[PDB]
Amino acid sequence: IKPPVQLFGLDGTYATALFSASAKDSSIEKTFQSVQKLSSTISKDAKVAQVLSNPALSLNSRKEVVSVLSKELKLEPVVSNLLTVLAENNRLSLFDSIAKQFSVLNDAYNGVVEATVVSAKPLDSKILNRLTKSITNSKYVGPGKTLKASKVNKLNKVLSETI
Amino acid sequence: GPASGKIRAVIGAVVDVQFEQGELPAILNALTIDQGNNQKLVLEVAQHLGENAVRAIAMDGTEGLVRGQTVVDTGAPISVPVGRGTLGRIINVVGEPIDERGPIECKQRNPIHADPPSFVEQSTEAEVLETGIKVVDLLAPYARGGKIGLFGGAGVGKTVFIQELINNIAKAHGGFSVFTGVGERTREGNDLYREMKETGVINLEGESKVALVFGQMNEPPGARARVALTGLTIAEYFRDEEGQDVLLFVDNIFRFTQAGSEVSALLGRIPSAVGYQPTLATDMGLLQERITTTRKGSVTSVQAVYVPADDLTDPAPATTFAHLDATTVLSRGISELGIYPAVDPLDSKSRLLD
Amino acid sequence: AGPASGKIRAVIGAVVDVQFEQGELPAILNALTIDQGNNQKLVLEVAQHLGENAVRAIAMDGTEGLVRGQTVVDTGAPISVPVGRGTLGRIINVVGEPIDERGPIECKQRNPIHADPPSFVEQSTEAEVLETGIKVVDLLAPYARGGKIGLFGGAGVGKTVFIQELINNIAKAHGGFSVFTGVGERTREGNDLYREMKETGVINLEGESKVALVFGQMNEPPGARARVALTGLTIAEYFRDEEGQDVLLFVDNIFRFTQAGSEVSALLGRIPSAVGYQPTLATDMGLLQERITTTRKGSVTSVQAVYVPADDLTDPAPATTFAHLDATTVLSRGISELGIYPAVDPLDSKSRLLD
Amino acid sequence: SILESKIRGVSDEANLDETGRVLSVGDGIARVFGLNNCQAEELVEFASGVKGMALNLEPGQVGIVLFGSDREVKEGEIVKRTGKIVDVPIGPGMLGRVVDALGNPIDGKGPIEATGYAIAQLKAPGILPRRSVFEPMQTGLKAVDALVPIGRGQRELIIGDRQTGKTAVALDTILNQKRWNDGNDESKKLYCVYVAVGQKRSTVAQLVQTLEQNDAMKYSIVVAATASEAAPLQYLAPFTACAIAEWFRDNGKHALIVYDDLSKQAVAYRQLSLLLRRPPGREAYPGDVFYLHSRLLERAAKMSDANGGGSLTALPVIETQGGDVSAYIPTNVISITDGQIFLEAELFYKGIRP
Amino acid sequence: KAAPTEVSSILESKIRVSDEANLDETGRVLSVGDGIARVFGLNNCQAEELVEFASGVKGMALNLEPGQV
Ligand SMILES: Nc1ncnc2c1ncn2[C@@H]1O[C@H](COP(=O)(O)OP(=O)(O)O)[C@@H](O)[C@H]1O
Ligand SMILES: Nc1ncnc2c1ncn2[C@@H]1O[C@H](COP(=O)(O)OP(=O)(O)O)[C@@H](O)[C@H]1O
Ligand SMILES: Nc1ncnc2c1ncn2[C@@H]1O[C@H](COP(=O)(O)OP(=O)(O)O)[C@@H](O)[C@H]1O
Numbered sequence A: 001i002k003p004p005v006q007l008f009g010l011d012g013t014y015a016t017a018l019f020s021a022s023a024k025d026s027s028i029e030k031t032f033q034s035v036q037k038l039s040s041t042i043s044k045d046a047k048v049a050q051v052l053s054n055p056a057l058s059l060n061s062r063k064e065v066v067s068v069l070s071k072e073l074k075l076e077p078v079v080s081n082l083l084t085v086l087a088e089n090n091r092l093s094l095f096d097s098i099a100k101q102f103s104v105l106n107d108a109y110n111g112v113v114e115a116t117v118v119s120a121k122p123l124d125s126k127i128l129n130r131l132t133k134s135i136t137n138s139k140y141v142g143p144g145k146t147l148k149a150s151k152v153n154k155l156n157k158v159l160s161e162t163i
Numbered sequence B: 001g002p003a004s005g006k007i008r009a010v011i012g013a014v015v016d017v018q019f020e021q022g023e024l025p026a027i028l029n030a031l032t033i034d035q036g037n038n039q040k041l042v043l044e045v046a047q048h049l050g051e052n053a054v055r056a057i058a059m060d061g062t063e064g065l066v067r068g069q070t071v072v073d074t075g076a077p078i079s080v081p082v083g084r085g086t087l088g089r090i091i092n093v094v095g096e097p098i099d100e101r102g103p104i105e106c107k108q109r110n111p112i113h114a115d116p117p118s119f120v121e122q123s124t125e126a127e128v129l130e131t132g133i134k135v136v137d138l139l140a141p142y143a144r145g146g147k148i149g150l151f152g153g154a155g156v157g158k159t160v161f162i163q164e165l166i167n168n169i170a171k172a173h174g175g176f177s178v179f180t181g182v183g184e185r186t187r188e189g190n191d192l193y194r195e196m197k198e199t200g201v202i203n204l205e206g207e208s209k210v211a212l213v214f215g216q217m218n219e220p221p222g223a224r225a226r227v228a229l230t231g232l233t234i235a236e237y238f239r240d241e242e243g244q245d246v247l248l249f250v251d252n253i254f255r256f257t258q259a260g261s262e263v264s265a266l267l268g269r270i271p272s273a274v275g276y277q278p279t280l281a282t283d284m285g286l287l288q289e290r291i292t293t294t295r296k297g298s299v300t301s302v303q304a305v306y307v308p309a310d311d312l313t314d315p316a317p318a319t320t321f322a323h324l325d326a327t328t329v330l331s332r333g334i335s336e337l338g339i340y341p342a343v344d345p346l347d348s349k350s351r352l353l354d
Numbered sequence C: 001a002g003p004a005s006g007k008i009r010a011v012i013g014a015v016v017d018v019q020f021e022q023g024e025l026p027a028i029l030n031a032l033t034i035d036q037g038n039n040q041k042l043v044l045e046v047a048q049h050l051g052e053n054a055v056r057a058i059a060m061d062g063t064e065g066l067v068r069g070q071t072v073v074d075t076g077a078p079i080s081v082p083v084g085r086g087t088l089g090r091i092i093n094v095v096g097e098p099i100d101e102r103g104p105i106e107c108k109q110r111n112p113i114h115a116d117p118p119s120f121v122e123q124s125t126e127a128e129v130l131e132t133g134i135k136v137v138d139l140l141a142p143y144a145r146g147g148k149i150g151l152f153g154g155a156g157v158g159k160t161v162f163i164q165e166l167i168n169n170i171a172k173a174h175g176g177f178s179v180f181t182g183v184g185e186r187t188r189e190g191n192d193l194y195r196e197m198k199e200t201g202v203i204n205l206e207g208e209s210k211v212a213l214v215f216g217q218m219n220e221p222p223g224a225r226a227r228v229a230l231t232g233l234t235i236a237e238y239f240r241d242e243e244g245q246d247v248l249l250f251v252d253n254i255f256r257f258t259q260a261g262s263e264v265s266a267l268l269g270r271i272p273s274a275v276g277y278q279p280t281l282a283t284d285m286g287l288l289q290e291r292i293t294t295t296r297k298g299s300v301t302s303v304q305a306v307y308v309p310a311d312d313l314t315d316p317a318p319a320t321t322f323a324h325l326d327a328t329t330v331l332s333r334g335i336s337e338l339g340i341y342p343a344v345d346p347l348d349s350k351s352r353l354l355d
Numbered sequence D: 001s002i003l004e005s006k007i008r009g010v011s012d013e014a015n016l017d018e019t020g021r022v023l024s025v026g027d028g029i030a031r032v033f034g035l036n037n038c039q040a041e042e043l044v045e046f047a048s049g050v051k052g053m054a055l056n057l058e059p060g061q062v063g064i065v066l067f068g069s070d071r072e073v074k075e076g077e078i079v080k081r082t083g084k085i086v087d088v089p090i091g092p093g094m095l096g097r098v099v100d101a102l103g104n105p106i107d108g109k110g111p112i113e114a115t116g117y118a119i120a121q122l123k124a125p126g127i128l129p130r131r132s133v134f135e136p137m138q139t140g141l142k143a144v145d146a147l148v149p150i151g152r153g154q155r156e157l158i159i160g161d162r163q164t165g166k167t168a169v170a171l172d173t174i175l176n177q178k179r180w181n182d183g184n185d186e187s188k189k190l191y192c193v194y195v196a197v198g199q200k201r202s203t204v205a206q207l208v209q210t211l212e213q214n215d216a217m218k219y220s221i222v223v224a225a226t227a228s229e230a231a232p233l234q235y236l237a238p239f240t241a242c243a244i245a246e247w248f249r250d251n252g253k254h255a256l257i258v259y260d261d262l263s264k265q266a267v268a269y270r271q272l273s274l275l276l277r278r279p280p281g282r283e284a285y286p287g288d289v290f291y292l293h294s295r296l297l298e299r300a301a302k303m304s305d306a307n308g309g310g311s312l313t314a315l316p317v318i319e320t321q322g323g324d325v326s327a328y329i330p331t332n333v334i335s336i337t338d339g340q341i342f343l344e345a346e347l348f349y350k351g352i353r354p
Numbered sequence E: 001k002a003a004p005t006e007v008s009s010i011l012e013s014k015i016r017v018s019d020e021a022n023l024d025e026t027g028r029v030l031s032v033g034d035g036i037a038r039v040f041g042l043n044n045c046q047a048e049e050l051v052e053f054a055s056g057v058k059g060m061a062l063n064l065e066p067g068q069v
């Protein structure tokens, strides 16, 4: 099963290949919380980040990081198989790219995205995009909206072209 | 227990060996590979790709090797037999005898990869060497103990020039000879051994004074490039440990640079001029500097170069002209007129013409 | 202050990749300062942007001594150079600094080296002849006043002697100021040109000068040689637009500008063209030749000298500059060996004022 | 936890600040994983004893070029940093010994009495610290002193083919200065600086023996740089020889450098750049081919009276192929030097020497 | 910046059970073009060995790398 989200084709195919086998028997909600624990214990920790950029590893320092971040962490399903495929193919240096592509699939097929003005929009999980944008723009413009560039730059360029 | 490895990739002569242990092999190290023919294989390590894996170059055919075979390391380089036991026998690139006369009973076995002489161990001279030709004793005179180059194209007279000089100078020189043919023909190797036995150069039942080294163009790329290092190791031991005027005869010298260019594309190196290797001046300078005259003994090198499609501006012909004292270029235009041989007087120069 | 500080991530030759923050990255053709160990600095011009909060910069000096992770501050604008009357008589560099040991250039304004050329409506055509003094230049291909002049020739034919002889009889009696900007010259040619102008009255150290000296030979790296043409043309363009004077830009040689860009084009991620050249040969040569023209504010007689590669006019650096020059003084190597001083071709030289 | 997983595994010490681990090495190149505080063109020392020069600095690795043999360097070796750049020895005590490309003595006379430490890649002189060439460099030849006379501070090229008079013109000018160097006039004496790059082992020993017998090796620096070493040693022979001769010109003496040859230095720089994963240019060479020869020759200029009054003469020999001067490396060196000496092969064979 | 062999199609077979058929002698054709055929498998296949496709075309395994042939 391939969802219509594209997401590049070479670098973004790591999380898309594992999402097909993980979408059976309701195993998609547990993969979101387990993928966040692997990136938070290798970045801001200064302990297990001694083989992130080095070309050593080799079985010893490659299989010990996948077992310590699954047994004592928070993994029991097929979450331990994701780190083993990146250790033998030399792909442990880009762990943030594999965890960021997994959260984009659940937000696209079960919610809205994009933006609008100022900050973010609302990203509702209704159905159509036209019926949800008109009901959320009137409630967000009144509440808040401090409004603290684009309209001033377009007016100055039109006056210089006619002179 | 020796260092055992596993084959990971094999593309022609290049065979990537992945060692399971942390003690990986060094460069220019002989590696063994058992198969099933009472001969095994000889693989020389070239570089290391990393991740407990080094790219090796086999000296024979790699047909039949599967992914995951046992690769044992010998711990040293490709050793060969040296001394007086190699005179009269036909050795190969790995030091094994190919004359069907038993094994070479040698006392010591020196490696094929060794450093050349330094600046303090060199010895220069200016002794002229009489060859017998009228175009060589007046134009470009050869020097005793130096490097002689017989350049020329195909069909001009490169193989006939080295055969005529060895039958009138090496037969009464006193020292031992070293005829190491690299990139020759199949019929040239058998005809050279039969002619030297009837004249008194190689005696199978007596005393000999000429070392023969096999290695034609019928082998792979690893055996042709390593044929020059095996023949030069036997001639260097007779001039340093014994102190004798050895005579190294290579035919041809252009096959050493052409064999390394075909295997340089699979090792990761980029191509150079006319599709050659990038280390052309480094590989040719390491082998030509060791075949010189030192303080313990001299070494008259009489090699022959092959012009690439009749062109002296190639990367394998112009780079070998700066490491020879006397040059003998053979033009293709004078060979069709009736000149025997086609000795070009406007191109052959030497350092003893003073 | 909000200075855009960057970190050096890669350094191979003249190209140096600097990694900055997200959103605070500099634009193209921006000067990047770098603190070294001496009292000077390491100027680096941003060429392209590789992405991921990183842009590849080209150093204008020696790249030896830079480590991975050094501070790289951005100036915010391009390579500023000193303009006005203060640059006359002093030896300026590619970054706008003095190299004559005569103190700093007291300039009130500093214009950038990277600027757009003139439009089609601001061009002013002319048909005036300029007398040089030679018998073969005043009869065959006459030089046009305010146009581009190209002295084509090979190595050892007479390219450097042709620009020096014309400056001692036309630039010394002109009303405007000169601008001798040498790019890709020699070490001995720079010292001999400055000493000859002081004894004739062109460059006065204690009086008034009318000749701008811009250093930058082949002794530096590839970044300073390619940026030497833009730094020297910025001082001559200000005297013809803001002041309104007939400037005279002397480039020696003009062929060194195209060869300097191809030396760093292989390390920047570009494919090679013909005869080992860069793919942007016609785009880089047209952006600098169109700005040294004659507009409605003033004229600019460019007397550059093109160097043919081993006497070959069919090269990509010689044939591309023939369409942006009015008078072309092509020299031949066969007439110089017979005794003709100089070797002026009477049939190969053409001009637009020969009507 | 993160602290409990590192106690049962992780790695050891080995800081990557001043040291590094070699991940891959071969064909002279050596990719060292680490060295964050290492500057560009810095001297690196491996664990086996071979020196290195980090020329390519990436974000994950660091390409270092070895100055010797890569047979002792393997994967995982420690590569320490010296903290300085590629420097060499200089001073008045270097006259009389055949030094190499890094300042080490190769003649067997012990240590070199160096008075300072100058870098190899130094900046050339400006237009304000240079004067006109007014001194006279007596070469000894009657055909060179009357026609194309050279002076102290100029760069005279010596183009020509092999065995035509390229190396003979530079050797005659150094021996002709014995009449002024044996006296007491320091302003008329000119120290020689022969930089034999690309030559063989027998050619460097023969040239040093002829100068010592004619009382000329006592005030001449010999830079030994044979073709049997690495590509980084032969390419850095021009920058190391120019730093030793620049000490005499900045004090009040005259120097004379002889870069023999200019064609051998261009082939050594393209071999090390092709193995470091870099794009080539024209004729399978690097992009900065013309900038490498123009920067080393621009430093040999005559200084003014406020800088000491010294000068440095450059004698670069260009090895041609059949008299072709319209090549890539031939036309680049002829348009940077102040004149050239064409050595044709037609008049050299008839007897008109040179 | 990446590598070949296991990619998309070849990377979704080792996560379950890549057995059934004998991969030592047979193999799946992953790519074909310019007179070549990148077959995924052939572990026990020797160098310069004769092969056969599904349509009846013969083949010769030249290079034998890890994961592809
Ligand atoms: N002195 C000579 N007189 C007549 N013919 C000769 C002489 N020397 C060589 N040849 C001819 O030159 C040819 C050389 O053949 P071959 O050795 O195969 O090519 P190459 O010399 O290029 O290696 C021989 O066939 C021989 O007939
Ligand atoms: N009018 C002239 N009379 C005699 N010789 C000249 C004249 N003009 C130039 N030359 C010669 O031409 C040579 C040019 O040298 P150089 O400037 O190095 O090369 P290029 O002119 O190609 O840049 C000088 O050595 C000079 O002797
Ligand atoms: N004045 C001279 N008289 C006689 N022979 C000379 C003279 N000058 C040079 N030679 C000869 O020219 C040869 C040059 O050899 P070499 O230096 O190896 O080549 P190149 O000169 O091309 O570098 C020497 O062997 C020498 O005998």
Ligand SMILES: [Mg+2]
Residues within 6 Å of the ligand: B158, B159, B160, B251
């Ligand atoms: Mg033959």
Ligand SMILES: [Mg+2]
Residues within 6 Å of the ligand: C159, C160, C161, C252
């Ligand atoms: Mg010039």
Ligand SMILES: [Mg+2]
Residues within 6 Å of the ligand: D166, D167, D168, D260
């Ligand atoms: Mg020489």
